[PDB]
Structure 1
């Protein structure tokens, strides 16, 4: 059984880089705080006790309001008068840094204006190991370089708007099956612990950890650790991922919160590097906590050192000052639990004053513009035989497929989007937001036809094949809509328990396209989905003249598409994952059966780095549409590749500091004038009897055997070779090579090119190409521009497990530039650099 080696102590914050001023202020405020106050910062107040999906008590004596933590990565969850943005996989499909930033900023403004302090997103974990993982859509791309840049830009947009961003889920939560014990039980599986991702050190550094290093370096405030185990140690108490990888190596200065229900111990978690417990209780409304009271006590009895709790407090306050949250503070002006204007203050037990719980604040501004633009710029044109753009002069237009029409229960009529009815604009689970409205393809395309006085109908029942065939025959174009859904594991739709059971079109989609293609010589397929689908039985049909994948566009879905279909937007999106011929061609199977008796299922990542296009490439498999593939209504030419070699840190930390003082147990007893709200989690002790007021069956049992070596060691520590900066040693960020290429629009209309830069790092076990750089360039017909990027030392390195460091190996390296991972007409050998 895979094992996770200890790494202690839990590194302490130091004001590194961009964090200096936030840290000074955090120190100055935490210095003034009592122990119970500090504890208050670390622990949620209990499932559905206050307004937000997570919420802490704050420090009322020092005028620090409770921190409000709300889902989701694509807009405010469980609220009203908010926008629904396209999903993160759409962001990835844009290959546009600027759009990722703008979406981050639009979300941040909305979260801010609801009195939300922390957004539970963006996501980069799951990275995308398996094309059927239920949550890949919440993230970006199975590619680390593309994912990391867009993750980082999204984080910066949110944080520049004055809300803490939360990089989640850290780390290796690559599937939904067996991610939680009670969740597996509800599906009839009996497991004593959650699935264990077992991964080698090289793989983790070069893939799953890489976007987290980008997030840390961009200044991310928070990280959320995951439900799964890593080598059979839970994500939210894994000292190797948390103390070693994230805090010592990556030099992470903010706080680590648990996923909801991912907290599995008081002492172990605190010493293994967790900073905040969400939603606060052990299970929802258990009125017990691994922290709160238990953590106050653990400091009082000598088990957790004051410096560790003080560091939790400093990291939490530092994230808060760093984004300027204190300057924007206001209590949450909505409730996640009800839409009622008035209600009891403490939702779950229905206690506290009866008062205004919703203000109905309209936070949307004009954000439908970025959503519409982004949806259009993420529409991948996979196939186009001179079919598109449409002109408006088409005489009779057939809109075919349920995915074009309305959800008959209303756009929000399935709780957490837990169905696949009508057009698919948002997948399911916690990564969701209430739509203010949803513009369907049916509405948008019908309005466009009628504006030109054409004829148009929508058929939206995918088994009405007789009416489909009859209409297809009469039409000048058939626009066929199809989808494939997925989502978080707590919701099952049609027996799909988060993870998709297959990669086939839902609701008869393949039969629908065939019914149409057999009758219109101009059949145009639109796919909405969470990731790749099997297109093998119809993509090469002579009557399927164009194919688009539009992802999950959010609220303006139909207008984003019309913009693309009718040429207002020249599509420039690129596939951010691989379209293979079969499920088998992707390998990386999901663990769907118990393979460790009734223990934790074991998920061995035995492919190593060979996921998505790296795997297709290794196996010599030819994708239908490759990573980086996307067409345009113009043409681009790449020429003139040139390479230019360019001219291009403490060894110990300080001792761990403590701020403020700890007093007697009697100081932290429940205050006499306070009504204790039922299920509410507090930092207080029933009496000075520590053991009895812990109520912990294991209190003082074999304590020292359960505290790992080094776990309480507050003395100076060595700086890891790969650490000592933000997102790693700052040398990794030295720019070693400049690359330049000329890109020309050789066609008849303006459009965006997406130049892509791959390297071959060389060596018997490396992928043949891996993406390193990209940009999205707007070019007029005949226009030329010189695209210039740089490669960093990290970009040219591999993880050396013996050195514990990034090393540029002695194998000769090459650069490749072109339009996709398989369309690389330019190549150049790289000279030795170190």
Structure 2
């Protein structure tokens, strides 16, 4: 069985650089506390005991209320008068740092307005190892660079708004199956331990860890360790994960909380790098552990100062307001127990925090539309003589937009997946609604919407008469505690839901101008219809949130040229992506064993390795205009030689082998600063090229920079940079980026550091992972 080596002691904050101010204030505060008050900060109050999804204990003596931790990565969960933003996968499809930032800011503002201290997001774990992973849509992309950059931008947005962000789930939670034993038992599996993700040191560094490094370096205040095990040690008590990788190598200065009820070795977890136990036994044991000397004073002191450092870093001291909503009821008032009797208190103030956020939600919606096919289908005018609209995915949730708890259904148009990664729609504009509005405001031609996928007679009837037929199909997934139609979080197949395929086939048989719109959490198998000549255009629109219908028609009717690029591969078969989900226990009653044998070869890397042609490759997307690439240039920057980190920490302040050692510790070679050794981010080359709009309308292009690292075990190409640029007809721009040392390095387990290998590297600039228009050598030096 795979084994996770120990690493102790648990690193304490250094509070260097951009954390110095926050460290100073945290020390000043924690210095004043008793042991009990310190432990209060690390202790969850219990499941559903207060107002927020999680809360810490209070310190009333100083007028410090418990921290409020609230879902989700795409909005304020449970609360009323909030916005429902597009999912993370949509953000990925924008390839737009700026939009990612603005979404973070808007979300952060909403959390702030409700009195939330910590937003439980964003997500880089799952990364997206499997196409059928249940929660991938909450994250960004299987690509570590695209995910990492947008993760970082999102975090900066949330935290600039004055709310602590939380990078989750750390790490290796690439599927929902067997994430928690209790949950697995509920689905009829006999296991007593969570699945072990078995991941080697190189795969972690070059794939799954990379975006979390970006999150650390972006100044993220907190981390959440995952339900699963890594190398047969639960994440929340995995010393290699938290102590070595996170707090030494990546030099994370913030605090680590557990996922809710995530299994850890109790007090032992604190020694292994856990700082906060959620949702809440731990408190009194940690107290006793300190008193009897199993847990050092310096450790609890560091747990407290990490929590308070995050608090001060984002300016909670300035922006905190009372929690003015309740997660567990919409009632205005409720009862609370007191020392004697009960108090009737106000619990929901109905504070409207939505502001103008509908604008950015509509914008990201439109920006996340990916045009996959266009044989003269798009754009539409609104002066079509007869528009047919087809599919339940065009219509309303008959139970109300928020009629399914945690969005745990596929009623009507899909604009959000299910589970904890949700928020309530203040309203939801359907495609049916937006399209009828478009028509009735313009040409006022005929329009009919058949939103029952079983009504194939009517679809035939209407499609036979249509100038254009707009077909809507979806595929849903989410968190493992919800099972929809045999999908236990993870998708049981890559098929369109509710007979979407038959809808497409029926409509295309009767209308030679059929447009297909896919709202899917990830890829589906489209091989049987995508190349149908009656299908004149195909778009993926993902999970667009409250403005779905409006953001879509903006694109379909040509107000916005589609400029999204698919953030994952569209393969011919499920086998194209690699091995199935592990959905059958393979270690008897023990932890299922999930070997990440493919290494870095997930999504497009896999397709590239096996020389398999995807239907639509990673980074592919069409436009209403054309773009031309020319004149690549590589400028060596003659960076200083990489220096491994050296020296030692200071001794652990007070305000298992090594677990209680508070003496100065050696700095790891690849460590030294948040996100790793600073030399890793030295700029090595400047690469530039000219992009021109050679067509007849304004549009966005996503130029992409790929690197061939050149080794026998390296992917043919890996994404290293990208931007989204608006170009008017005949407009040119110089696209210029830099490659860092990290960008051209490989992880070396032997030396425990990033190395630039001797193999010749090649840089490519193109419009997709396969459309590599330009290339040049990276000259060694």
In the superposition, the TM-score normalised over structure 1's length comes to 0.92
The aligned residue for residue 435 of structure 2 is 445
Cross-structure match for 2:377: 387
After superposition, give the CA deviation of every residue in 1:746-779 in whole Å (9 maximum; x if it has no partner): 0111111110000000111110000000001111
What's the CA shift string for 1:379-430, capped at 9, x where partnerless? 0000001211101121000000000000011110001000001000000000
Matches for 1:125-524 after TM superposition, within 5 Å? 125-280=125-280, 289=281, 291-345=282-336, 352-452=342-442, 453-524=444-515
Task: Report how far residue 352 of structure 1 moved.
Answer: 4.6
- Structure 2 equivalent of residue 51 of structure 1: 51
- The answer to whether the 8 Å contact 1:639/1:743 transfers is yes
CA distance in 1, matches of 2:616, 2:16: 44
Match of residue 737, structure 2, among 779, 784, 789: 789
Deviations 1:412-471 (A, max 9, x none): 000100000100000000000010000000000011011121110100010110100111
By how many angstroms is 1:58 displaced?
Answer: 2.4
Query: Within 1, Cα distance between the matches of 2:12 and 2:577?
Result: 41
Aligned residue in 2 for 1:606: 597
Residues of 2 paired with 1:588 and 1:612: CA distance?
A: 12
Q: Contact 2:646–2:669 at 8 Å: present in 1 too?
A: no
Aligned counterparts of 1:409 and 1:618: Cα–Cα separation in 2? 46
Q: 8 Å contact 2:646–2:668 — kept in the other structure? A: no
- Once the 2 structures are TM-superposed, how far is the Cα of residue 294 of structure 1 from its aligned partner? 1.2
Q: Secondary structure at the match of 1:457?
A: strand
CA apart distance, 1:650: 4.9
Matches of 2:106 and 2:290, distance apart in 1? 41
- Give the SS at the match of 1:39: helix
**SS across alignment from 1:331:** coil
Instruction: Flag the 1:101–1:351 CA change in 2: closer, same or farther, 3 A.
Output: farther
Query: Which of 579, 584, 595 is equivalent to 2:586?
Result: 595
Per-residue CA deviation, residues 616-641 of structure 1 (Å, 9 max, x unaligned), is: 00011100000000000010011010
The answer as to whether partners of 1:112 and 1:161 remain within 8 angstroms in 2 is yes
Partners of 1:812 and 1:378 in 2: CA distance: 36
Between the aligned partners of 1:535 and 1:143, the Cα distance in structure 2 is 22
Q: What CA distance in whole angstroms lies between the structure 1 residues aligned with 2:582 and 2:372?
A: 31
* Alignment partners' CA distance in 2, 1:346 and 1:769: 61
Deviation at 1:651, TM superposition (A): 1.8
Separation in structure 2 between the aligned mates of residue 498 and residue 325 of structure 1, nearest angstrom: 35
Across the two proteins, how many residue pairs are aligned to each other?
775
What is the alpha-carbon distance in structure 2 between the residues aligned to residue 778 and residue 220 of structure 1? 30
Deviations 1:753-808 (A, max 9, x none): 11000000011111000000000111110000100000000000000010100000
Q: Is the CA contact 1:227–1:262 (under 8 Å) kept in the aligned structure 2?
A: yes
Q: Which residue of 2 aligns with 1:696?
A: none
Contact 1:123 1:139 in 2 (8 A): yes
Partner Cα separation in structure 2 for residue 263 and residue 318 of structure 1: 26
Q: Alignment partner for residue 761 of structure 2, among 809, 813, 821?
A: 813
For residues 391 and 770 of structure 2, the distance between their equivalents in structure 1, rounded to whole angstroms, comes to 32
Structure-2 separation of matches of 1:31 and 1:355: 34
In structure 2, what is the Cα distance between the partners aligned to 1:800 and 1:378?
37
- SS of structure 1 residue aligned to 2:208: coil
Q: Which of 539, 552, 559 is the matching residue for 1:568?
A: 559
Distance 1:600 1:397 in 2: 54
The residue number in structure 2 matching 1:652 is 648
2:449 aligns to what SS in structure 1?
strand
Aligned with 1:527 (options 512, 518, 522): 518
In structure 2, C-alpha distance between the alignment counterparts of 1:363 and 1:113, rounded to whole Å: 6
CA distance in 1, matches of 2:375, 2:584: 44
For each residue in 1:200-240, what CA deviation from the matched residue of structure 2 results, as whole angstroms up to 9, or x when unmatched?
10000000000000000000000000000001100111000
SS at match of 1:207: helix
SS of aligned partner of 2:335:
strand
- Alpha-carbon RMSD: 1.2
* Partners of 1:233 and 1:521 in 2: CA distance: 56
1:354 & 1:590 partners in 2: Cα distance? 50
Residues 685 and 739, structure 2, Cα contact 8 Å, conserved in 1: yes
Deviations 1:720-746 (A, max 9, x none): 000001100000000010000000000
Q: Unpaired segments of 5 or more residues in structure 1? A: 281-288, 660-707
Task: State how far apart, in whole Å, the 2-side matches of 1:118 and 1:158 are.
Answer: 10
Does the CA-based 8 Å contact 1:67-1:117 persist in structure 2?
Answer: yes
SS of equivalent residue, structure 1 residue 257: strand
Question: Normalising by structure 2, what TM-score?
Answer: 0.98
Q: Deviations over 1:584-607 (max 9, x none)?
A: 100132110010001010100000
Contact 2:395 / 2:430 at 8 angstroms: preserved in 1? yes
Q: Indicate the SS of the match to 1:292.
A: helix
Contact 1:102 1:157 in 2 (8 A): yes
**Deviation >2 Å, runs of 4+:** 263-266, 349-352, 647-650
Q: Paired residue for 2:691, among 743, 752, 756?
A: 743
Residue 88 of structure 2: aligned partner: 88
Cα distance in structure 2, aligned partners of 1:47 and 1:352: 20
Name the CA shift for 1:802/1:352 in 2 (closer, same or farther; >3 Å). Answer: farther
Following the alignment from structure 1 to structure 2, what is the Cα–Cα distance between the partners of residues 145 and 133? Answer: 19
Looking at structure 2, the residues matched to 346 and 211 of structure 1 have their Cα atoms a distance apart, in angstroms, of 44
